[PDB]
């Protein structure tokens, strides 16, 4: 919106009277064009689960283009009005204590989707005798797949692994969803050697 | 117009009174320090050149 102001002073009209406008009062100067202002975010309450924005009941501040052109038209979000805030607030109490089941957080769904379609390369050194335990296996998620896994969540095949081979790790994300990832135990190769060996070669 | 010899400078009192007076000096000479009467303190005090006002 163009905001303008007059160069020339308008004389006071007084109570109950209209200002007397000379032709000189049509000369304007541009105070501000509000399209160039820094953009502010739109506060919405999510109804379904969006891939990156959040999960149902989460107050999300999104770009006005995203909320207006995608979430609100498609029903993915609703306005964070006093009424809508109360409706969703009541639901969050029932989920915590009532019959309504608890649901993954925004990050939890992202990890589950990644954990559904990923394979862990648990590189183990040949020289030293090694036994695979939740703590050691947990370390490899961080290094290889980039997932930060709590040691307790991991459930190993429960058969001691001391030989290169294939097994299965059952990961539980936040205690609700249990994912079984393929496990590929391989001879450990240092980062520099592995990248030069294959990534550079091919 | 092109010719240029002297300059006008502001001499400021060293007494802290803020009293100033303008004097003419040669452009190629060193900054002036003068003993001049300061009305605020009502006696002659040292004045030191601070700024050049214009070219004379």
């Amino acid at each position: 919106t163009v905001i303008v102001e007059r160069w020339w002073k308008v004389p006071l009209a007084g109570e109950g009277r209209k200002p007397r406008l000379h032709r000189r009062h049509r000369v304007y100067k541009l105070v501000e064009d509000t399209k160039h202002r820094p953009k502010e975010n739109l506060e919405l309450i999510l109804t379904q689960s969006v891939e990156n924005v959040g999960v149902r009941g989460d107050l999300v501040s999104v770009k006005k283009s995203l909320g207006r052109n995608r979430l609100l038209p498609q029903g993915l979000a609703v306005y964070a009005s006093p009424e809508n805030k109360k409706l969703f607030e009541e639901e969050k109490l029932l989920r915590q204590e009532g019959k309504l089941e608890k649901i993954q957080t925004k990050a939890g769904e992202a990890t589950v989707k990644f954990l559904k379609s990923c394979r862990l390369e648990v590189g183990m050194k040949n020289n030293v005798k090694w036994e695979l335990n939740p703590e050691i296996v947990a370390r490899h998620f961080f290094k290889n797949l980039g997932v930060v896994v709590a040691p307790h969540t991991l459930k190993l095949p429960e058969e001691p692994i001391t030989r290169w081979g294939e097994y299965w790790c059952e990961v539980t994300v936040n205690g609700l969803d249990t994912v079984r990832v393929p496990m590929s135990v391989v001879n450990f190769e240092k980062p520099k050697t592995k990248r030069y060996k294959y990534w550079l070669a091919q | 117009k092109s010719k240029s010899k002297n300059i006008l400078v502001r001499m400021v009192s060293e007494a802290g009174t803020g009293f100033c007076f303008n004097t003419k000096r040669n452009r190629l000479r060193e900054k002036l320090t003068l003993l001049h009467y300061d009305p605020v303190v009502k006696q002659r005090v040292l004045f030191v050149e601070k700024k050049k006002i214009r070219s004379l």
Binding site: R26, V27, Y28, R68, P73, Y79, S81 | -
Partner: protein
């Protein structure tokens, strides 16, 4: 529709100047009317609709002198008639 001084200096020429709003064609949905409308709007209109929490609230809340639209006033009558009946 107004005038400006060139280079914002009153001692310069006075020129005619028209400032036009940036217009956008957008689709809106009315809950009371259960219909979608393709309306040409401004970014201010979108902001006002967001502050009202929907098109229906904006149409019903906004007085005639602020709507500045015959189409908007017809939507108001439509929504009000459905609520009244």
């Amino acid at each position: 529709l107004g005038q400006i001084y060139a280079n914002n200096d009153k001692l310069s020429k006075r020129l005619k100047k028209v400032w036009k709003p940036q217009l956008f064609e957008r689709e809106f949905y009315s809950e009371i009317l259960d219909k979608k409308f393709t309306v040409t709007v401004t970014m201010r209109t979108l902001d006002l609709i967001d502050e009202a929490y929907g098109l229906d609230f904006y149409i019903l809340k906004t007085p005639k002198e602020d709507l500045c639209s015959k189409f908007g006033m017809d939507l108001k009558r439509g929504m009000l008639l459905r609520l009244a009946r």
